[PDB]
Amino acid sequence: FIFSPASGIVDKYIGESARIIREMFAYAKEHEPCIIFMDEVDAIGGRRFSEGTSADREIQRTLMELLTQMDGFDNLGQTKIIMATNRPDTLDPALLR
């Protein structure tokens, strides 16, 4: 197990917050079977946005990284996602997929 809180994988440095989550799927393929519990995700749950602040394209960079992992030429595995959220209609519908 890990784990990842919604907001301790978020970093100030960009391409550093992509780094953890890419490398945390890597870990999952050596230490397999694995369960990846995302806890109380609403942080990068956010939609396309980016008519707001710069925060919302920080969300966007980190979200795109998850999709190539989940389904891509990167394939899984014996790695499992358990995603815990407190309201699911916050989410981007590409995380309802």
Ligand X SMILES: Nc1ncnc2c1ncn2[C@@H]1O[C@H](COP(=O)(O)OP(=O)(O)OP(=O)(O)O)[C@@H](O)[C@H]1O
Binding-site ranges for ligand X (CB under 6 A): 67, 71, 94
Closest CA to 86 of 49, 17, 38, 50: 38
Which x/- pattern over 36-75 shows residues binding another protein (rule: CB under 8 A)? --------------xx-----x--xx-xxx-xx--xxx-x
What phi and psi, each to the nearest 5 degrees, are found at residue 25? -70, -35
**Measured between alpha carbons, how far is 17 from 33 in angstroms, rounded to an integer?**
24
Measured from the CB atom, is 35 or 88 closer to another protein? 88
Rounded CA gap, 97 and 83, in Å?
A: 13
61's contact among ligand X, another protein, none, with CB below 5 to 8 A by partner kind, is another protein
Nearer to ligand X, 20 or 70 (CB): 70
CB of 67: closest distance to ligand X in angstroms?
4
CA distance 29 to 39: 21
| Least CB distance to ligand X at residue 59 (A) | 16
